[PDB]
Design a protein around this motif. Structure first.
Motif, PDB file in Angstrom:
ATOM      1  N   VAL A 101       0.676  -1.209  -0.074  1.00 14.55           N
ATOM      2  CA  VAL A 101      -0.074   0.140  -0.130  1.00 14.55           C
ATOM      3  C   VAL A 101       0.945   1.299   0.146  1.00 14.55           C
ATOM      4  O   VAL A 101       0.538   2.145  -0.558  1.00 14.55           O
ATOM      5  CB  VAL A 101      -1.290   0.043   1.214  1.00 14.55           C
ATOM      6  N   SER A 102       1.846   0.976   0.901  1.00 17.48           N
ATOM      7  CA  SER A 102       2.828   2.367   0.930  1.00 17.48           C
ATOM      8  C   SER A 102       4.247   2.372  -0.183  1.00 17.48           C
ATOM      9  O   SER A 102       4.709   3.507  -0.325  1.00 17.48           O
ATOM     10  CB  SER A 102       3.416   2.450   2.265  1.00 17.48           C
ATOM     11  N   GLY A 103       4.356   1.221  -0.782  1.00 19.68           N
ATOM     12  CA  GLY A 103       5.553   1.072  -1.634  1.00 19.68           C
ATOM     13  C   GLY A 103       6.838   1.774  -1.145  1.00 19.68           C
ATOM     14  O   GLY A 103       7.111   2.552  -1.368  1.00 19.68           O
ATOM     15  N   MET A 104       7.297   1.027  -0.210  1.00 21.03           N
ATOM     16  CA  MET A 104       8.521   1.491   0.642  1.00 21.03           C
ATOM     17  C   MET A 104       9.369   0.440   1.057  1.00 21.03           C
ATOM     18  O   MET A 104       8.963  -0.544   2.052  1.00 21.03           O
ATOM     19  CB  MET A 104       7.707   2.341   1.822  1.00 21.03           C
ATOM     20  N   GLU A 105      10.873   0.394   0.801  1.00 24.05           N
ATOM     21  CA  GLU A 105      11.603  -0.630   1.368  1.00 24.05           C
ATOM     22  C   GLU A 105      11.788  -0.299   2.644  1.00 24.05           C
ATOM     23  O   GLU A 105      11.639   0.875   3.111  1.00 24.05           O
ATOM     24  CB  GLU A 105      13.083  -0.181   0.576  1.00 24.05           C
ATOM     25  N   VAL A 106      12.201  -1.294   3.473  1.00 27.62           N
ATOM     26  CA  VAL A 106      12.366  -1.315   4.831  1.00 27.62           C
ATOM     27  C   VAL A 106      13.610  -0.307   5.366  1.00 27.62           C
ATOM     28  O   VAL A 106      13.483  -0.076   6.489  1.00 27.62           O
ATOM     29  CB  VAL A 106      12.600  -2.588   5.559  1.00 27.62           C
ATOM     30  N   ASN A 107      14.378  -0.166   4.777  1.00 31.76           N
ATOM     31  CA  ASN A 107      15.482   1.067   4.691  1.00 31.76           C
ATOM     32  C   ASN A 107      15.139   2.535   4.713  1.00 31.76           C
ATOM     33  O   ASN A 107      15.569   3.233   5.483  1.00 31.76           O
ATOM     34  CB  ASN A 107      16.631   0.838   3.860  1.00 31.76           C
ATOM     35  N   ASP A 108      14.070   2.485   3.841  1.00 30.80           N
ATOM     36  CA  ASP A 108      13.085   3.895   4.168  1.00 30.80           C
ATOM     37  C   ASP A 108      12.349   4.424   5.060  1.00 30.80           C
ATOM     38  O   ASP A 108      12.154   5.294   5.515  1.00 30.80           O
ATOM     39  CB  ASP A 108      12.647   4.053   2.735  1.00 30.80           C
ATOM     40  N   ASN A 109      11.725   3.206   5.836  1.00 32.51           N
ATOM     41  CA  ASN A 109      10.834   3.103   7.097  1.00 32.51           C
ATOM     42  C   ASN A 109      11.637   4.018   8.107  1.00 32.51           C
ATOM     43  O   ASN A 109      10.909   4.888   8.575  1.00 32.51           O
ATOM     44  CB  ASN A 109      10.523   1.964   7.435  1.00 32.51           C
ATOM     45  N   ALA A 110      12.827   3.613   8.423  1.00 33.10           N
ATOM     46  CA  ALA A 110      13.478   4.465   9.499  1.00 33.10           C
ATOM     47  C   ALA A 110      13.663   5.894   9.347  1.00 33.10           C
ATOM     48  O   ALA A 110      13.184   6.435  10.210  1.00 33.10           O
ATOM     49  CB  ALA A 110      15.061   3.514   9.839  1.00 33.10           C
ATOM     50  N   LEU A 111      14.109   6.214   8.124  1.00 35.40           N
ATOM     51  CA  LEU A 111      14.092   7.795   8.030  1.00 35.40           C
ATOM     52  C   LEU A 111      12.814   8.508   8.228  1.00 35.40           C
ATOM     53  O   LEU A 111      12.697   9.497   9.113  1.00 35.40           O
ATOM     54  CB  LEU A 111      14.768   8.147   6.778  1.00 35.40           C
ATOM     55  N   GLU A 112      11.756   7.859   7.547  1.00 31.77           N
ATOM     56  CA  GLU A 112      10.630   8.581   7.685  1.00 31.77           C
ATOM     57  C   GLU A 112       9.724   8.562   9.008  1.00 31.77           C
ATOM     58  O   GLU A 112       9.353   9.719   9.466  1.00 31.77           O
ATOM     59  CB  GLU A 112       9.437   7.569   6.830  1.00 31.77           C
ATOM     60  N   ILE A 113      10.210   7.539   9.789  1.00 29.54           N
ATOM     61  CA  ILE A 113       9.556   7.642  11.179  1.00 29.54           C
ATOM     62  C   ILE A 113      10.598   8.533  12.174  1.00 29.54           C
ATOM     63  O   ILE A 113       9.899   9.325  12.589  1.00 29.54           O
ATOM     64  CB  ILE A 113       9.846   6.028  11.883  1.00 29.54           C
ATOM     65  N   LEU A 114      11.857   8.624  11.812  1.00 27.65           N
ATOM     66  CA  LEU A 114      12.733   9.649  12.670  1.00 27.65           C
ATOM     67  C   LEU A 114      12.409  11.067  12.260  1.00 27.65           C
ATOM     68  O   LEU A 114      12.638  11.831  13.157  1.00 27.65           O
ATOM     69  CB  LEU A 114      14.072   9.400  12.316  1.00 27.65           C
ATOM     70  N   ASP A 115      12.019  11.187  10.993  1.00 21.99           N
ATOM     71  CA  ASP A 115      11.591  12.599  10.625  1.00 21.99           C
ATOM     72  C   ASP A 115      10.121  12.924  11.157  1.00 21.99           C
ATOM     73  O   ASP A 115       9.857  14.177  11.592  1.00 21.99           O
ATOM     74  CB  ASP A 115      11.342  12.555   9.044  1.00 21.99           C
ATOM     75  N   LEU A 116       9.317  11.946  11.083  1.00 20.20           N
ATOM     76  CA  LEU A 116       7.935  12.098  11.951  1.00 20.20           C
ATOM     77  C   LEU A 116       8.128  12.652  13.198  1.00 20.20           C
ATOM     78  O   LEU A 116       7.375  13.392  13.868  1.00 20.20           O
ATOM     79  CB  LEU A 116       7.119  10.852  12.089  1.00 20.20           C
ATOM     80  N   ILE A 117       9.142  12.121  14.387  1.00 20.63           N
ATOM     81  CA  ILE A 117       9.536  12.218  15.467  1.00 20.63           C
ATOM     82  C   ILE A 117       9.909  13.703  15.454  1.00 20.63           C
ATOM     83  O   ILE A 117       9.234  14.389  16.273  1.00 20.63           O
ATOM     84  CB  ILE A 117      10.532  11.247  16.089  1.00 20.63           C
ATOM     85  N   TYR A 118      10.839  14.288  14.775  1.00 21.96           N
ATOM     86  CA  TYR A 118      11.387  15.590  14.823  1.00 21.96           C
ATOM     87  C   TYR A 118      10.251  16.462  14.796  1.00 21.96           C
ATOM     88  O   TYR A 118      10.381  17.382  15.340  1.00 21.96           O
ATOM     89  CB  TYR A 118      12.403  15.816  13.652  1.00 21.96           C
ATOM     90  N   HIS A 119       9.405  16.297  13.605  1.00 18.98           N
ATOM     91  CA  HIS A 119       8.255  17.286  13.539  1.00 18.98           C
ATOM     92  C   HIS A 119       6.957  17.329  14.350  1.00 18.98           C
ATOM     93  O   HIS A 119       5.995  18.261  14.667  1.00 18.98           O
ATOM     94  CB  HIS A 119       7.756  17.385  11.994  1.00 18.98           C
ATOM     95  N   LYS A 120       6.872  16.170  15.418  1.00 17.51           N
ATOM     96  CA  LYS A 120       5.728  15.902  16.113  1.00 17.51           C
ATOM     97  C   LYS A 120       5.775  16.564  17.581  1.00 17.51           C
ATOM     98  O   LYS A 120       6.887  16.909  18.107  1.00 17.51           O
ATOM     99  CB  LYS A 120       5.787  14.433  16.686  1.00 17.51           C
TER     100      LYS A 120
END
Length: 667
Positions: free
Chosen positions: A312-331
């Motif tokens: 559904v998201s079309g995302m390799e498991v190495n991309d998940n970490a950065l996206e999550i870490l980025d979500l943390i910064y702006h939250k």
């Protein structure tokens, strides 16, 4: 409110006092001022349930458990289990059931019956009685007392804060050696949470279910913890507390068994079908970032039958970490308990996880910046300080690395007694302080092996010695011993002992190689063989440094046939690598490694042949070592001697010389 302004000022003074050691002049002074502010707010709006609860939590968070209890519950004389000839079963650390309190027969609530300094009330004050029938004088009206006897109501935030209190995991809270154990009671904590469902008229309160679940989670019973988090989601599937709790529990099971199916499949369900990934807490989000950084991504499809890319998201498991870490910064996050908000741009654990991600993808300058930020935002984050020490070791700044590793040690000792007061403390509790000892011993080991801040080949071309160099290696082994002694140390706090994760395989492999290298350089070839023989199936017949060191020790112990095998394997590997590279470049460090190893293997293959009586293949191989060395503008004096001395031997059993140098690392 004006009362609320005084009450707020006192909460700030309690938080402020937290940055001071217990028993210090400033800490005591700031608590006195907080209680004066509380008394100003009490003279205007007394028996304030919200403020009684906030003072109880802030005090708990600054390890002031007696102060916290007088705020969350109160003070009665004799206290539960404290009275003379009163059974110990009634005590706060033994009782199961919550105290059902009523005032004395024919007594009503009067604020003048509370012994307050300005109250100066009468000798006859108030008396509470619990299901035990014991009459106790009310000295302080805390939240629990105010709700049952003043307001005659059932306040759920009060019950839940009491459930969180009695179930705290801080070592200062539980360890009798620190003055704790008085209020520690998980059974009583579960029973304060269960009061919300019934007397509090809220049967599906998720905070109460999550509270009970966290109690089982802290006891490492992840199966029971899962049932309670799943009970939250059986009612409301969009619950970030329930789904978040489930994700946190699956990560703990994953650390134990190596299986990522449940974390990955549940995170995808949470993200693509529930759309609550953003709604997950800064702590849950950081655990998920850590999961993705540590995950074996190349195993997923074959070993666990998990598609490494989302549907559904079309995302390799190495991309998940950065996206999550980025979500943390702006939250931004409101504290569910105190209401005080945390900006992700000031969240230390998020920065630490970010530094770990950048380290995993080899962005060391970027990684250093984030670990420095984590260490500054949280003076207790010893793991950020350890990773900063490890980065300095890589850069060959051993003086800076030692200083950072001593900071890491002081940070662990200075704050460990409060581990559990924050959700972020799980990272610190689960870290291994033996890794800091391994890093320190790894500096002492490289200093003994001639590696210094200027050696950042021929620095790794170390030959077995001669007197003082064997001495400083044997002393570094005591540091490698302390590192291993930590994981088995039964002296530490119960919490740290049961959650301490053992030294990772990559460090264990380094530890075996380092110990074997000290044996080898000291002339104890048989000991180095016995040490390196333990090496894993895949790495035994693979690493050239290991195969070379093992073959050299085989030759020195008379096992000429066994050594031949390793040298021939290395020869095949180095001749294979030679097809990928073109013209030999002496300036290039990789050409230096390949050619220099090939020189050693050629001469050593010749030495084995000499010992077996094959003069022809011995001479041919010494010449091969001589010519190979000349290709990188070098000479093998050892091979030149073996060639020139072949029929000029001056003693029976005079062995040819080995090119027996060996890299101190398996890199």
């Amino acid at each position: 409110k004006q009362a609320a302004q005084y009450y707020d000022q006192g909460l700030t003074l309690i938080r402020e006092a937290g940055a001071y050691p217990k028993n210090s002049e400033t800490r005591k002074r700031k608590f006195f001022e907080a209680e004066e502010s509380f008394a100003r707010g009490e003279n205007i709006l007394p028996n304030h349930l919200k403020y009684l609860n906030l003072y109880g939590i802030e005090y708990t968070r600054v390890e002031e458990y007696d102060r916290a209890f007088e705020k969350l519950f109160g003070k009665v004389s004799p206290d539960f289990g404290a009275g003379g000839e009163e059974p110990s079963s009634n005590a706060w650390d033994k009782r199961e059931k919550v105290p059902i309190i009523t005032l004395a027969k024919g007594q009503v609530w009067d604020n003048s019956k509370l012994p307050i300094a300005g109250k100066v009330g009468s000798e006859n004050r108030m008396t509470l009685i619990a299901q035990d029938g014991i009459q106790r004088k009310i000295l302080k009206a805390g939240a629990y007392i105010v709700m049952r006897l003043e307001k005659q109501t059932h306040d759920n935030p009060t019950y839940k804060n009491l459930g969180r209190f009695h179930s705290s995991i801080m070592p200062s809270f539980t360890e009798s050696s620190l003055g704790g154990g008085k209020y520690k009671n998980d059974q009583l904590a579960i029973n304060f949470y269960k009061q919300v469902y019934t007397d509090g008229n809220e049967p599906y309160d998720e905070e109460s279910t999550a509270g009970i679940a966290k109690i089982y989670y802290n006891r490492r019973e992840f199966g029971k913890a899962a049932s309670f988090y799943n009970k939250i989601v059986e009612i409301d599937p969009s619950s970030p507390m329930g789904q978040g709790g489930l994700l946190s529990t699956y990560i703990e099971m994953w650390k134990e068994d190596g299986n990522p199916q449940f974390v990955i499949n549940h995170h995808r369900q949470i993200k693509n079908n529930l759309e609550i990934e953003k709604k997950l807490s800064l702590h849950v989000l950081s655990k998920l970032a850590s999961f993705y950084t540590n995950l074996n991504k190349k195993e997923l499809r074959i070993r666990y039958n998990i598609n490494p890319i989302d549907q559904v998201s079309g995302m390799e498991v190495n991309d998940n970490a950065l996206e999550i870490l980025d979500l943390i910064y702006h939250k931004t996050e409101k504290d569910p308990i105190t209401g005080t908000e945390i900006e992700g741009s000031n969240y230390a654990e998020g920065y630490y996880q970010r530094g770990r991600y950048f380290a995993s993808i080899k962005e060391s300058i970027q990684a250093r910046r984030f670990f420095e930020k984590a260490a500054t935002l949280d003076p207790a984050h010893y793991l950020a300080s350890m990773e900063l020490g490890e980065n300095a070791i890589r850069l060959a700044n051993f003086g800076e690395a030692d200083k950072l590793l001593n900071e890491s040690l002081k940070r662990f000792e200075n704050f460990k007694q409060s581990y559990g007061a924050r959700e972020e403390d799980e990272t610190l509790i689960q870290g291994n302080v033996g890794r800091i000892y391994f890093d320190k011993a790894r500096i002492q080991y490289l200093s003994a092996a001639g590696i210094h801040e200027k050696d950042k080949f021929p620095g790794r071309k170390i030959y077995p010695f001669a007197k003082t160099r064997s001495m400083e290696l044997k002393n570094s082994l005591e540091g490698f011993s302390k590192a291993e002694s930590v994981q088995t140390d039964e002296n530490e706090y119960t919490l740290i002992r049961r959650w301490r994760t053992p030294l990772p395989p990559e460090i264990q492999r380094e530890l075996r190689y380092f110990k074997g290298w000290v044996d080898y350089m000291s002339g104890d070839f048989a000991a180095s063989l016995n040490e390196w023989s333990g090496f894993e199936d895949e790495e035994e017949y693979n690493h050239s440094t290991l195969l070379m060191g093992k073959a050299n020790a085989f030759f020195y112990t008379g096992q000429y046939k066994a050594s031949l095998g390793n040298y021939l394997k290395v020869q095949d590997d180095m001749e294979e690598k030679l097809l990928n590279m073109g013209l030999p470049k002496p300036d290039d460090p990789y050409h230096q490694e390949v050619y220099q190893t090939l020189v050693a293997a050629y001469n050593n293959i010749g030495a084995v042949y000499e010992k077996q009586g094959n003069t022809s293949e011995a001479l041919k191989h010494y010449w091969k070592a001589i010519e190979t060395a000349r290709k990188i503008n070098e000479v093998s004096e050892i091979a030149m001697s073996n060639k020139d001395l072949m029929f000029k031997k001056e003693a029976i059993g005079q062995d040819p010389l080995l090119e027996d140098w060996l890299s101190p690392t398996l890199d």
